[PDB]
């Protein structure tokens, strides 16, 4: 089998970014890479898979993720 | 002009149509392609239910706007 899998990140605006990542790489690497891409900061957004928050130390294997799984990313700011 | 039809299956079908030809034709076309019917499906533009007798003109549609498809329903 493959050491790695493909994961996608979908934002509210419909944008999708796809990452190739090792099954045992902490997902913090993916989140930082997404932040760099979109020019945002980690504290500005949250990542969720199957409705559960993704922790920086969580790996694809630990979350039992599969090839082509999509992660949903949410911005935390609110107007007042 | 060009008009996009956003479906519920993750896909978008794009059609070119005159500014004054009823969308009734576009509807039965999309349905014809996805093997759907029109009793089961409804269409909306910017949130408003579309009538079959509407053209892109009176609904002030422009180039590359989007039509949204939805499964007919009602609560009870």
């Amino acid at each position: 089998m493959n050491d790695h899998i493909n994961l996608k990140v979908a934002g509210q605006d419909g944008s999708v970014v796809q990452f190739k990542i090792k099954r045992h790489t902490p997902l913090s690497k993916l989140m930082k890479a997404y932040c760099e891409r979109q020019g945002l900061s980690m504290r500005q957004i949250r990542f969720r898979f199957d409705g559960q928050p993704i922790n920086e130390t969580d790996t694809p294997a630990q979350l039992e993720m599969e090839d082509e799984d999509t992660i949903d990313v949410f911005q935390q700011q609110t107007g007042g | 002009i060009n008009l996009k039809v956003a479906g519920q299956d993750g896909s978008v079908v794009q059609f070119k149509i005159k500014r004054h030809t009823p969308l009734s034709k576009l509807m039965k076309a999309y349905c014809e392609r996805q093997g759907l019917s029109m009793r089961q499906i409804r269409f909306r533009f910017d949130g408003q239910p579309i009538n079959e007798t509407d053209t892109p003109a009176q609904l002030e549609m422009e180039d590359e706007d989007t039509i949204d498809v939805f499964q007919q329903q009602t609560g009870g």
Binding site: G14, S15, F19 | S11, V12, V13, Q14, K25
Partner: peptide, 21 residues
């Protein structure tokens, strides 16, 4: 008259990034 133009993903992959290194 109707004419088909194209059919594609509603949310296409915009960019691919490789984290294997």
């Amino acid at each position: 008259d109707i004419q088909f133009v194209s059919e594609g993903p509603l949310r296409p992959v915009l960019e691919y990034i490789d984290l294997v290194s």
